[PDB]
Amino acid sequence: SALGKLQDVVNQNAQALNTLVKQLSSNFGAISSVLNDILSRLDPPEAEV
Amino acid sequence: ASVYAWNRKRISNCVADYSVLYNSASFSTFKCYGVSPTKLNDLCFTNVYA
């Protein structure tokens, strides 16, 4: 643990990137979190929404 | 069947051609909510309950 500062920098960057990737799995109130599903499922009027 | 005794029919293990169903011009009502009516010919489902 003597090299804690560099490891914390690396871990902070890794957690930020992992959180950024994980946010793509959230639908944010939409029917699905996957664009392809909405593209192949819906009609462009509400698909836009 | 009547409304209080509504029947649930399992539609499964079948090839679905909704194009002819949509092409019919003798429907009083026709509407889809969770999926586009013309996109049913590409997606694959199961456990379709009538």
From Swiss-Prot, chain A:
Highest classification ranks of the organism: Viruses, Riboviria, Orthornavirae, Pisuviricota, Pisoniviricetes
The protein's name in its UniProt record: Spike protein S2'
Coiled coil: 7-49
Entry superkingdom: Viruses
Organism: Severe acute respiratory syndrome coronavirus 2 (2019-nCoV)
Gene name for this UniProt entry: S
Consequence recorded when altering L39F: In strain: Omicron/BA.1
Function as written in the Swiss-Prot or TrEMBL entry: Subunit of the fusion protein that is processed upon entry into the host cell. Mediates fusion of the virion and cellular membranes by functioning as a class I viral fusion protein. Contains a viral fusion peptide that is unmasked after S2 cleavage. This cleavage can occur at the cell membrane by host TMPRSS2 or during endocytosis by host CSTL. In either case, this triggers an extensive and irreversible conformational change that leads to fusion of the viral envelope with the cellular cytoplasmic membrane, releasing viral genomic RNA into the host cell cytoplasm.
Outcome when changing S40A: In strain: Alpha/B.1.1.7
Swiss-Prot record, chain B:
Result, substituting S28F: In strain: Omicron/BA.1, Omicron/BA.2, Omicron/BA.2.12.1, Omicron/BA.2.75, Omicron/BA.4, Omicron/BA.5, Omicron/BQ.1.1, Omicron/XBB.1.5, Omicron/EG.5.1
UniProt effect for mutating S26P: In strain: Omicron/BA.1, Omicron/BA.2, Omicron/BA.2.12.1, Omicron/BA.2.75, Omicron/BA.4, Omicron/BA.5, Omicron/BQ.1.1, Omicron/XBB.1.5, Omicron/EG.5.1
Highest taxon listed in the record's lineage: Viruses
Consequence the record notes for mutating L21I: In strain: Omicron/XBB.1.5, Omicron/EG.5.1
Effect of S24F: In strain: Omicron/BA.2, Omicron/BA.2.12.1, Omicron/BA.2.75, Omicron/BA.4, Omicron/BA.5, Omicron/BQ.1.1, Omicron/XBB.1.5, Omicron/EG.5.1
Subunit structure: Binds to host ACE2. RBD also interacts with the N-linked glycan on 'Asn-90' of ACE2. Cleavage of S generates a polybasic C-terminal sequence on S1 that binds to host Neuropilin-1 (NRP1) and Neuropilin-2 (NRP2) receptors. Interacts with host integrin alpha-5/beta-1 (ITGA5:ITGB1) and with ACE2 in complex with integrin alpha-5/beta-1 (ITGA5:ITGB1). May interact via cytoplasmic c-terminus with M protein. May interact (via N-terminus) with host bilirubin and biliverdin, thereby preventing antibody binding to the SARS-CoV-2 spike NTD via an allosteric mechanism.
Function: Attaches the virion to the cell membrane by interacting with host receptor, initiating the infection. The major receptor is host ACE2. When S2/S2' has been cleaved, binding to the receptor triggers direct fusion at the cell membrane. When S2/S2' has not been cleaved, binding to the receptor results in internalization of the virus by endocytosis using host TFRC and GRM2 and leading to fusion of the virion membrane with the host endosomal membrane. Alternatively, may use NRP1/NRP2 and integrin as entry receptors.
Name of the protein in question: Spike protein S1
Organism: Severe acute respiratory syndrome coronavirus 2
Lineage, top ranks: Viruses, Riboviria, Orthornavirae, Pisuviricota, Pisoniviricetes
Gene giving rise to this polypeptide: S
Complete-protein stretch covered: 348 to 397 of 1273
